[PDB]
Amino acid sequence: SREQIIKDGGNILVTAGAGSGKTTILVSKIEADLKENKTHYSIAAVTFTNKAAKEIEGRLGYSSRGNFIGTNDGFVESEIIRPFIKDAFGNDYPDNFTAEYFDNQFASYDKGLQVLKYQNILGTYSNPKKNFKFQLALDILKKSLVARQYIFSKYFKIFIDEYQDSDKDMHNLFMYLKDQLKIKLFIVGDPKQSIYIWRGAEPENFNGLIENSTDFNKYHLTSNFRCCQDIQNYSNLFNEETRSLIKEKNEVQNVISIADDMPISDILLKLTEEKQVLNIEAELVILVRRRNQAIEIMKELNEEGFNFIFIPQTPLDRATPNATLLKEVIKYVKNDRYSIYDLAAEIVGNLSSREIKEIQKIINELLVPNINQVLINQVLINLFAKLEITLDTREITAFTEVMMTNEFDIAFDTNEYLHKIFTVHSAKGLEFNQVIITASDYNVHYNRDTNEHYVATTRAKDKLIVIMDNKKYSDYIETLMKELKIKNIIKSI
Amino acid sequence: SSKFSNITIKNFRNFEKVNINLDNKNVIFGMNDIGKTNFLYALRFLLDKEIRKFGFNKSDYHKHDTSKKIEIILTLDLSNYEKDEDTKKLISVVKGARTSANADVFYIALESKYDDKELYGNIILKWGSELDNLIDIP
Amino acid sequence: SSKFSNITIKNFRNFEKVNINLDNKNVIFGMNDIGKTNFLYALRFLLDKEIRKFGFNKSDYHKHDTSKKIEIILTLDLSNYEKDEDTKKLISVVKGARTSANADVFYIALESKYDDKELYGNIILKWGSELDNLIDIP
């Protein structure tokens, strides 16, 4: 498992999925290797977005080892291109160059050298599949002897995040550091095609390393690593592929089942005061299928003194290529404390201060109120035109609808609330500490809602409370408990 | 086969112009007790932060002449980079101050010019692969 | 009508967070003898080269907490530039670190972060017209 992962000191290839399993293990693996190694060598972690680089830097702590934590583009720029470009190509080339991602697309590698030599800027390649900065960095290393000496002397291992999005030119540099410079590589990626890719992503180079590489040591990560063992056993029994991984335990305490005989508010009081299996001071969230089921529970609790705020699923809450970025644009529009730098951190690459000012100009048109649906669509196209990303028609309408109304404001609110209620689709992504669900929502016999039920069960982190509303739900438990000869998988009050 | 090649001391106290080859282990001796002590202080001024912050006084200049500039250069050999771990220590910090044409050598220099009004000459540390265009140590 | 506006002292010795307005002539007094001495030392660390080269020790940090950073900012007023000769002294050295939008104000700050391994936190001096993007004093 994870203990076997961190012990390996060689080239490690990690398959990460379900989210957050990659980030926590990455930070723990980095800080553990820093404690083992006392020599002068440092580590280098590279992330596509600037937020992930800042997220890793905050958890690691002091970087007195000289460790580099930053963007993929910022790494090759500050460590390879800028220091040794004059050594590789002569004194004609500048080291005070400014890289602009959006401007100055060129057709050939020879053309881009002239933009850097004469126009004093570092422009991107026109083809999204070919990266000019990494082609330049790899070229500089082969031309410059000092460049190869410095990289070997500075870093002994390099950590790479989200490797499935790396392009071929970006992939060539990483393999060049491992094959020629003999630098250890810790690779984290998602083998599934998924929904999120960098504009020049090719999953085959990552998939090819899993199939034909003898140097790397392959590992895998559990999807529900953060969930406790008792919650994992209750979640995995509903899907046939997941039933094999769980192991039975002599005593089960985290998953509680209680039949709904008293009103909904009384069940909440019973679990909080009579058995104290749920703490009122800990965050508590309740699961529903539809928005109406959440409203009636929220209104029933306001009468009993319980205070709650309910997050609804927005039109943007849909598996689309630009869903993650579109939500961040909404968070910058809705919230005043959300800085433009926080929005730029979500954008791939380390944008310059001048490029940030141009993107800020496009979005400032959305900060004026009551300017109708047509202008919101053009600002959105103008925004994504600079990023060279086309926008889905339903993604545009979903973005527009959220901008018009204040209905989905708290779903993108920066503030955090202790007690909430969310829909199964509302928080498909984020995870909660303790969750209560009801059985009548999910049809378990024909597996229509088993995927929504599996998501519902995996959201809870410490304690999961299940209400046995449906007899067919309880029958599917008792039937499969006999197939697997499981005496206890649930704790009933 | 030694990282420390030679050290040059110009116009520093009793050192008019002195060139001394070096190695990893060095032993200095002789009748001139003043020269041995100034030799160690000349190395501290180049490498010891605590002794370097105090700067140069009028007495530290050779023959108490403030017109002549004090110059202390340490020549280093980086040829054994492939098998010397301490050599890679220096490379990791020097970064781009080296050139590939003269990758085997690296210079560490101390230059000092005296100001009459300020009554104080500061210590400027430069390094680089070429002795002609040394750059200020960041 | 005074160049010296106010001084801010954060996390320096017994000064948790202290803001003091100023003028050309200032007199400090009170029961706390430790506060008066640390007040003068806080000004020396910002402006006296000889006392600034020694850097910050663990004791100089407030409540001996090295996590919190020491910050000493001196706010200046350059409105009387047309008739104040000493104001033109500062302008001639600051050069482009000022912006025309905030030409009336200028900040002089001292920032210090502690390193556990180096057992020593250095003194970094920044100045500039805007308090948000202060730049290192050359």
Tab-separated table of C-alpha atoms in Angstrom, chain A residues 11-400:
chain	number	residue	atom	x	y	z
A	11	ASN	CA	11.743	5.806	-10.281
A	12	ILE	CA	8.105	5.578	-9.167
A	13	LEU	CA	5.081	5.635	-11.483
A	14	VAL	CA	1.842	6.217	-9.558
A	15	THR	CA	-1.697	5.794	-10.899
A	16	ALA	CA	-3.912	8.214	-8.964
A	17	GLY	CA	-7.685	8.555	-9.141
A	18	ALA	CA	-10.825	9.805	-7.376
A	19	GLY	CA	-9.037	13.055	-6.461
A	20	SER	CA	-7.012	14.277	-3.463
A	21	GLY	CA	-5.313	10.887	-3.191
A	22	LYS	CA	-2.549	12.321	-5.379
A	23	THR	CA	-1.923	15.542	-3.449
A	24	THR	CA	-1.713	14.176	0.099
A	25	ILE	CA	0.596	11.304	-0.870
A	26	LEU	CA	2.739	13.675	-2.953
A	27	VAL	CA	3.347	16.078	-0.055
A	28	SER	CA	3.992	13.214	2.367
A	29	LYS	CA	6.393	11.504	-0.050
A	30	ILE	CA	8.294	14.760	-0.607
A	31	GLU	CA	8.709	15.717	3.055
A	32	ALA	CA	9.667	12.137	3.942
A	33	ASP	CA	12.458	12.043	1.350
A	34	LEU	CA	13.729	15.417	2.584
A	35	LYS	CA	14.065	13.927	6.072
A	36	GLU	CA	15.913	10.838	4.816
A	37	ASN	CA	18.407	12.717	2.624
A	38	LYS	CA	20.887	15.006	4.395
A	39	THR	CA	23.025	15.859	1.350
A	40	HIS	CA	22.925	19.094	-0.626
A	41	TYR	CA	20.638	17.761	-3.365
A	42	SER	CA	17.138	19.234	-3.555
A	43	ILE	CA	13.786	18.139	-4.956
A	44	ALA	CA	11.654	19.751	-7.652
A	45	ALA	CA	7.865	19.436	-7.841
A	46	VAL	CA	6.061	20.689	-10.954
A	47	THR	CA	2.311	21.263	-11.290
A	48	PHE	CA	0.337	22.459	-14.300
A	49	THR	CA	-1.677	25.075	-12.394
A	50	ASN	CA	-0.240	27.644	-9.999
A	51	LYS	CA	-2.786	26.776	-7.299
A	52	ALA	CA	-1.549	23.185	-7.005
A	53	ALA	CA	2.036	24.424	-6.667
A	54	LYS	CA	0.983	26.841	-3.921
A	55	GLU	CA	-1.055	24.086	-2.253
A	56	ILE	CA	1.984	21.797	-2.041
A	57	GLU	CA	4.250	24.591	-0.787
A	58	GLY	CA	1.913	25.395	2.105
A	59	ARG	CA	1.798	21.844	3.457
A	60	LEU	CA	5.535	21.152	3.138
A	61	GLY	CA	6.654	24.070	5.311
A	62	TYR	CA	10.158	25.518	5.177
A	63	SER	CA	12.078	24.957	1.952
A	64	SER	CA	15.592	25.582	3.259
A	65	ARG	CA	16.766	22.657	1.104
A	66	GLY	CA	16.407	24.981	-1.893
A	67	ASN	CA	13.556	22.820	-3.154
A	68	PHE	CA	11.720	24.148	-6.207
A	69	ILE	CA	7.911	24.201	-5.994
A	70	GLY	CA	6.249	25.868	-8.952
A	71	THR	CA	4.706	25.640	-12.396
A	72	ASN	CA	5.926	23.379	-15.198
A	73	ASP	CA	6.433	26.442	-17.398
A	74	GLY	CA	8.129	28.340	-14.575
A	75	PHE	CA	10.531	25.464	-13.926
A	76	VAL	CA	12.083	25.197	-17.393
A	77	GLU	CA	12.104	28.996	-17.609
A	78	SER	CA	13.949	29.806	-14.378
A	79	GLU	CA	16.174	26.708	-14.173
A	80	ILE	CA	17.094	25.879	-17.788
A	81	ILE	CA	16.221	28.517	-20.381
A	82	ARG	CA	17.001	31.797	-18.618
A	83	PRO	CA	20.351	30.792	-17.009
A	84	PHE	CA	21.976	28.915	-19.896
A	85	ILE	CA	20.464	30.298	-23.107
A	86	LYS	CA	23.492	32.534	-23.730
A	87	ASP	CA	25.796	29.561	-23.134
A	88	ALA	CA	23.820	27.380	-25.547
A	89	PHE	CA	23.146	29.878	-28.351
A	90	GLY	CA	25.693	32.671	-27.816
A	91	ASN	CA	25.604	36.181	-26.397
A	92	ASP	CA	23.140	37.313	-29.089
A	93	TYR	CA	20.188	35.873	-27.120
A	94	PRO	CA	18.801	37.699	-24.067
A	95	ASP	CA	18.331	36.458	-20.522
A	96	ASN	CA	15.856	39.238	-19.627
A	97	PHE	CA	13.264	37.824	-22.038
A	98	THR	CA	9.544	37.947	-21.252
A	99	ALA	CA	7.377	34.951	-22.149
A	100	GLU	CA	3.877	35.703	-23.463
A	101	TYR	CA	1.621	32.676	-23.874
A	102	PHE	CA	-1.134	34.210	-26.002
A	103	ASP	CA	0.861	36.366	-28.426
A	104	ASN	CA	3.354	35.576	-31.191
A	105	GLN	CA	2.421	32.147	-32.479
A	106	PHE	CA	4.855	30.879	-35.104
A	107	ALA	CA	5.020	27.977	-37.531
A	108	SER	CA	8.583	26.640	-37.248
A	109	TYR	CA	11.167	26.205	-34.501
A	110	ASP	CA	13.527	28.468	-36.457
A	111	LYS	CA	10.913	31.240	-36.487
A	112	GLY	CA	10.499	31.233	-32.707
A	113	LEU	CA	14.242	31.650	-32.193
A	114	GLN	CA	14.105	34.945	-34.094
A	115	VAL	CA	11.240	36.201	-31.919
A	116	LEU	CA	13.398	35.445	-28.885
A	117	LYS	CA	16.597	36.809	-30.440
A	118	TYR	CA	15.214	40.015	-31.989
A	119	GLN	CA	11.766	40.646	-30.473
A	120	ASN	CA	13.053	39.635	-27.004
A	121	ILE	CA	9.967	37.548	-26.142
A	122	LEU	CA	9.267	33.827	-25.747
A	123	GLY	CA	6.195	32.848	-27.747
A	124	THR	CA	4.166	29.657	-27.805
A	125	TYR	CA	3.893	27.232	-30.696
A	126	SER	CA	0.873	27.456	-32.983
A	127	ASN	CA	0.307	23.694	-32.843
A	128	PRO	CA	-1.182	22.779	-29.434
A	129	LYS	CA	0.520	19.360	-29.524
A	130	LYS	CA	4.029	20.859	-29.800
A	131	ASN	CA	5.510	22.870	-26.925
A	132	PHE	CA	8.163	25.424	-27.854
A	133	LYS	CA	9.432	26.191	-24.335
A	134	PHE	CA	10.172	22.534	-23.591
A	135	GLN	CA	11.646	22.072	-27.068
A	136	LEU	CA	13.858	25.068	-26.281
A	137	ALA	CA	14.787	23.778	-22.820
A	138	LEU	CA	15.734	20.330	-24.130
A	139	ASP	CA	17.744	21.964	-26.924
A	140	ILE	CA	19.547	24.226	-24.439
A	141	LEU	CA	20.558	21.274	-22.257
A	142	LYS	CA	22.111	19.410	-25.197
A	143	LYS	CA	23.943	22.546	-26.369
A	144	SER	CA	25.172	23.707	-22.937
A	145	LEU	CA	27.505	21.619	-20.784
A	146	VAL	CA	26.994	23.834	-17.721
A	147	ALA	CA	23.222	23.435	-18.060
A	148	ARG	CA	23.539	19.654	-17.726
A	149	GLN	CA	25.989	20.011	-14.833
A	150	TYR	CA	23.721	22.380	-12.895
A	151	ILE	CA	20.578	20.246	-13.234
A	152	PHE	CA	22.412	17.139	-12.013
A	153	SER	CA	24.051	19.036	-9.146
A	154	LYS	CA	20.857	20.743	-7.943
A	155	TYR	CA	18.099	18.103	-8.056
A	156	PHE	CA	18.252	14.397	-7.226
A	157	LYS	CA	14.527	13.690	-7.710
A	158	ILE	CA	11.726	15.447	-9.589
A	159	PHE	CA	8.034	15.121	-8.711
A	160	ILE	CA	5.496	15.500	-11.531
A	161	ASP	CA	1.755	16.000	-11.016
A	162	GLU	CA	-1.014	15.203	-13.525
A	163	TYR	CA	1.289	13.493	-16.005
A	164	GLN	CA	-1.548	12.423	-18.327
A	165	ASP	CA	-1.876	16.059	-19.437
A	166	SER	CA	1.806	16.378	-20.377
A	167	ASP	CA	2.466	16.836	-24.089
A	168	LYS	CA	5.147	15.009	-26.087
A	169	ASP	CA	7.726	17.818	-25.966
A	170	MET	CA	7.056	18.112	-22.235
A	171	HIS	CA	7.400	14.325	-21.980
A	172	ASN	CA	10.705	14.311	-23.885
A	173	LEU	CA	12.385	16.628	-21.374
A	174	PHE	CA	11.357	14.536	-18.358
A	175	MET	CA	12.613	11.333	-19.989
A	176	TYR	CA	15.817	13.140	-20.987
A	177	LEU	CA	16.478	13.965	-17.329
A	178	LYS	CA	15.942	10.315	-16.368
A	179	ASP	CA	17.748	8.617	-19.263
A	180	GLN	CA	20.699	10.989	-19.742
A	181	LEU	CA	21.051	12.885	-16.452
A	182	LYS	CA	19.909	9.890	-14.338
A	183	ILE	CA	17.525	11.910	-12.157
A	184	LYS	CA	14.892	10.033	-10.166
A	185	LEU	CA	11.328	10.744	-11.301
A	186	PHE	CA	8.210	10.473	-9.132
A	187	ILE	CA	5.262	10.495	-11.541
A	188	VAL	CA	1.609	10.929	-10.541
A	189	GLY	CA	-1.171	10.661	-13.100
A	190	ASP	CA	-4.637	9.400	-13.941
A	191	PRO	CA	-4.756	6.569	-16.524
A	192	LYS	CA	-8.439	7.216	-17.257
A	193	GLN	CA	-9.226	9.651	-20.066
A	194	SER	CA	-11.524	11.648	-17.744
A	195	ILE	CA	-12.737	15.164	-18.537
A	196	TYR	CA	-9.833	17.545	-17.795
A	197	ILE	CA	-6.868	17.833	-20.172
A	198	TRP	CA	-4.293	20.513	-20.904
A	199	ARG	CA	-4.688	21.848	-24.440
A	200	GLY	CA	-1.795	19.726	-25.719
A	201	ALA	CA	-2.418	16.617	-23.634
A	202	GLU	CA	-1.621	13.170	-25.025
A	203	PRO	CA	-2.524	10.343	-22.600
A	204	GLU	CA	-0.606	7.784	-24.686
A	205	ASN	CA	2.838	8.862	-23.451
A	206	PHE	CA	1.675	8.256	-19.878
A	207	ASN	CA	-0.098	5.044	-20.898
A	208	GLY	CA	2.994	3.948	-22.819
A	209	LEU	CA	5.155	4.199	-19.704
A	210	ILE	CA	2.743	1.915	-17.830
A	211	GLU	CA	3.005	-0.714	-20.583
A	212	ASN	CA	6.598	-0.766	-21.842
A	213	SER	CA	8.855	0.908	-19.261
A	214	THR	CA	11.203	-1.370	-17.293
A	215	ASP	CA	12.878	1.456	-15.350
A	216	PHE	CA	9.766	2.708	-13.550
A	217	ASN	CA	8.111	0.913	-10.631
A	218	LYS	CA	4.330	0.981	-11.023
A	219	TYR	CA	1.964	1.620	-8.113
A	220	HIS	CA	-1.751	2.212	-7.596
A	221	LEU	CA	-3.832	4.296	-5.188
A	222	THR	CA	-7.151	3.442	-3.567
A	223	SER	CA	-10.076	5.630	-4.609
A	224	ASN	CA	-11.505	5.959	-1.088
A	225	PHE	CA	-8.219	6.212	0.812
A	226	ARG	CA	-9.460	9.048	3.029
A	227	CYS	CA	-12.627	7.209	4.086
A	228	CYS	CA	-12.395	4.936	7.110
A	229	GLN	CA	-12.430	1.162	6.736
A	230	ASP	CA	-16.010	0.734	7.976
A	231	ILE	CA	-17.383	3.286	5.502
A	232	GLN	CA	-15.344	1.683	2.707
A	233	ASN	CA	-16.922	-1.708	3.425
A	234	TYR	CA	-20.458	-0.303	3.307
A	235	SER	CA	-19.822	1.589	0.062
A	236	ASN	CA	-18.057	-1.139	-1.916
A	237	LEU	CA	-20.670	-3.858	-1.332
A	238	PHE	CA	-23.228	-2.346	-3.729
A	239	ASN	CA	-21.052	-2.554	-6.869
A	240	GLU	CA	-19.818	-5.984	-7.942
A	241	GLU	CA	-16.354	-4.796	-8.999
A	242	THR	CA	-15.896	-3.116	-5.601
A	243	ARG	CA	-17.099	-6.048	-3.452
A	244	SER	CA	-13.781	-7.904	-3.835
A	245	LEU	CA	-11.483	-5.263	-2.318
A	246	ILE	CA	-13.166	-4.914	1.083
A	247	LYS	CA	-12.222	-7.098	4.048
A	248	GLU	CA	-14.561	-7.902	6.923
A	249	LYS	CA	-13.970	-6.558	10.437
A	250	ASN	CA	-14.989	-8.142	13.740
A	251	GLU	CA	-16.587	-4.910	15.022
A	252	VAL	CA	-18.289	-2.144	13.021
A	253	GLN	CA	-18.826	1.251	14.658
A	254	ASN	CA	-18.664	3.994	12.003
A	255	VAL	CA	-21.758	3.136	9.920
A	256	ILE	CA	-25.042	3.564	11.816
A	257	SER	CA	-28.477	2.428	10.626
A	258	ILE	CA	-31.708	3.670	12.210
A	259	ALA	CA	-35.235	3.164	10.901
A	260	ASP	CA	-37.136	6.428	10.408
A	261	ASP	CA	-40.072	6.098	12.805
A	262	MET	CA	-40.074	9.591	14.371
A	263	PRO	CA	-40.008	12.921	12.487
A	264	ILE	CA	-36.842	13.924	10.654
A	265	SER	CA	-35.849	16.526	13.250
A	266	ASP	CA	-36.366	14.002	16.061
A	267	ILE	CA	-33.998	11.509	14.415
A	268	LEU	CA	-31.387	14.279	14.344
A	269	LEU	CA	-31.951	14.989	18.043
A	270	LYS	CA	-31.917	11.265	18.855
A	271	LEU	CA	-28.555	10.688	17.163
A	272	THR	CA	-27.043	13.831	18.712
A	273	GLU	CA	-28.236	13.536	22.330
A	274	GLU	CA	-29.537	10.041	23.127
A	275	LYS	CA	-26.632	8.100	21.582
A	276	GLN	CA	-24.129	10.932	20.897
A	277	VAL	CA	-22.916	9.170	17.739
A	278	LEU	CA	-22.995	12.541	15.935
A	279	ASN	CA	-21.468	15.711	17.377
A	280	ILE	CA	-23.322	18.993	16.870
A	281	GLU	CA	-19.949	20.781	16.896
A	282	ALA	CA	-18.685	18.656	13.995
A	283	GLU	CA	-19.934	19.407	10.497
A	284	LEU	CA	-23.132	17.539	9.608
A	285	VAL	CA	-24.604	17.247	6.110
A	286	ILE	CA	-27.716	15.487	4.804
A	287	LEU	CA	-28.211	13.919	1.375
A	288	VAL	CA	-31.221	14.260	-0.936
A	289	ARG	CA	-31.870	13.449	-4.588
A	290	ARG	CA	-33.940	16.495	-5.590
A	291	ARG	CA	-34.019	20.142	-4.562
A	292	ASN	CA	-37.518	19.772	-3.091
A	293	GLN	CA	-36.364	17.060	-0.679
A	294	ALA	CA	-33.717	19.444	0.677
A	295	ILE	CA	-36.092	22.401	1.042
A	296	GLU	CA	-38.622	20.472	3.141
A	297	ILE	CA	-35.871	19.142	5.419
A	298	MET	CA	-34.341	22.616	5.720
A	299	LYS	CA	-37.704	24.191	6.565
A	300	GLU	CA	-38.586	21.472	9.085
A	301	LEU	CA	-35.314	22.090	10.970
A	302	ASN	CA	-35.736	25.878	11.127
A	303	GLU	CA	-38.848	25.273	13.235
A	304	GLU	CA	-36.919	23.114	15.729
A	305	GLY	CA	-34.125	25.655	16.266
A	306	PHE	CA	-31.720	23.961	13.850
A	307	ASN	CA	-30.054	26.465	11.513
A	308	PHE	CA	-28.938	25.281	8.082
A	309	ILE	CA	-27.764	26.613	4.728
A	310	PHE	CA	-28.339	24.439	1.654
A	311	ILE	CA	-26.007	24.348	-1.358
A	312	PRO	CA	-27.837	23.553	-4.630
A	313	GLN	CA	-26.298	21.959	-7.714
A	314	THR	CA	-25.634	24.635	-10.332
A	315	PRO	CA	-26.037	24.289	-14.112
A	316	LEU	CA	-22.221	24.283	-14.264
A	317	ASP	CA	-22.094	21.184	-12.024
A	318	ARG	CA	-21.730	18.926	-15.070
A	319	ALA	CA	-18.896	16.754	-16.377
A	320	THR	CA	-17.628	19.100	-19.103
A	321	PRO	CA	-14.079	19.993	-20.201
A	322	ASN	CA	-14.220	23.582	-18.886
A	323	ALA	CA	-16.438	23.035	-15.830
A	324	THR	CA	-13.628	23.583	-13.318
A	325	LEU	CA	-12.394	26.817	-14.906
A	326	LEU	CA	-15.910	28.163	-15.524
A	327	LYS	CA	-16.779	27.816	-11.832
A	328	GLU	CA	-13.671	29.801	-10.878
A	329	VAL	CA	-14.716	32.614	-13.219
A	330	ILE	CA	-18.048	32.677	-11.369
A	331	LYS	CA	-16.308	32.752	-7.980
A	332	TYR	CA	-14.319	35.808	-9.074
A	333	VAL	CA	-17.484	37.553	-10.271
A	334	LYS	CA	-19.666	36.659	-7.282
A	335	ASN	CA	-17.154	37.242	-4.462
A	336	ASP	CA	-15.232	40.484	-3.939
A	337	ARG	CA	-12.553	38.945	-1.696
A	338	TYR	CA	-11.704	36.421	-4.434
A	339	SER	CA	-8.663	38.024	-6.053
A	340	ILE	CA	-7.814	38.068	-9.746
A	341	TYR	CA	-4.544	36.345	-8.809
A	342	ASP	CA	-6.538	33.436	-7.374
A	343	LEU	CA	-8.276	33.147	-10.748
A	344	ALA	CA	-4.964	33.344	-12.620
A	345	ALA	CA	-3.561	30.581	-10.402
A	346	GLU	CA	-6.215	28.193	-11.744
A	347	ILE	CA	-5.159	28.981	-15.325
A	348	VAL	CA	-2.554	26.582	-16.710
A	349	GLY	CA	0.912	28.112	-16.794
A	350	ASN	CA	2.563	30.980	-14.929
A	351	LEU	CA	0.959	34.022	-16.537
A	352	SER	CA	2.933	37.256	-16.561
A	353	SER	CA	1.759	40.447	-14.881
A	354	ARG	CA	1.002	42.055	-18.252
A	355	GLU	CA	-0.941	39.008	-19.465
A	356	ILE	CA	-2.879	39.042	-16.182
A	357	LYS	CA	-3.887	42.660	-16.811
A	358	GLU	CA	-5.293	41.761	-20.242
A	359	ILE	CA	-7.349	38.853	-18.884
A	360	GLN	CA	-8.577	41.082	-16.048
A	361	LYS	CA	-9.788	43.605	-18.636
A	362	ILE	CA	-11.971	41.006	-20.378
A	363	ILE	CA	-13.615	39.830	-17.148
A	364	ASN	CA	-14.257	43.350	-15.792
A	365	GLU	CA	-17.183	43.582	-18.228
A	366	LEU	CA	-18.997	40.944	-16.140
A	367	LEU	CA	-18.640	43.012	-12.952
A	368	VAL	CA	-21.218	45.578	-14.121
A	369	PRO	CA	-24.816	44.663	-13.200
A	370	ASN	CA	-27.794	44.012	-15.449
A	371	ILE	CA	-26.158	43.754	-18.876
A	372	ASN	CA	-28.269	40.860	-20.201
A	373	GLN	CA	-27.515	37.435	-21.635
A	374	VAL	CA	-25.968	38.481	-24.964
A	375	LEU	CA	-23.017	40.408	-23.512
A	376	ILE	CA	-22.192	37.577	-21.088
A	377	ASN	CA	-21.751	35.178	-24.012
A	378	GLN	CA	-19.362	37.473	-25.898
A	379	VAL	CA	-17.210	38.197	-22.836
A	380	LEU	CA	-16.985	34.431	-22.329
A	381	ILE	CA	-15.916	33.808	-25.931
A	382	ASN	CA	-13.419	36.680	-25.707
A	383	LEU	CA	-12.029	35.190	-22.488
A	384	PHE	CA	-11.580	31.666	-23.852
A	385	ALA	CA	-10.335	32.953	-27.218
A	386	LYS	CA	-7.203	34.219	-25.463
A	387	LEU	CA	-6.766	30.797	-23.829
A	388	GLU	CA	-7.307	29.083	-27.223
A	389	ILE	CA	-10.163	26.978	-25.831
A	390	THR	CA	-13.528	26.526	-27.504
A	391	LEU	CA	-16.593	26.526	-25.267
A	392	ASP	CA	-19.494	24.080	-25.307
A	393	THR	CA	-22.884	25.584	-26.120
A	394	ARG	CA	-24.420	24.199	-22.926
A	395	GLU	CA	-21.358	25.385	-20.990
A	396	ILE	CA	-22.059	28.930	-22.200
A	397	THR	CA	-25.732	28.791	-21.197
A	398	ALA	CA	-24.855	27.230	-17.833
A	399	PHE	CA	-22.360	30.035	-17.191
A	400	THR	CA	-24.902	32.647	-18.295
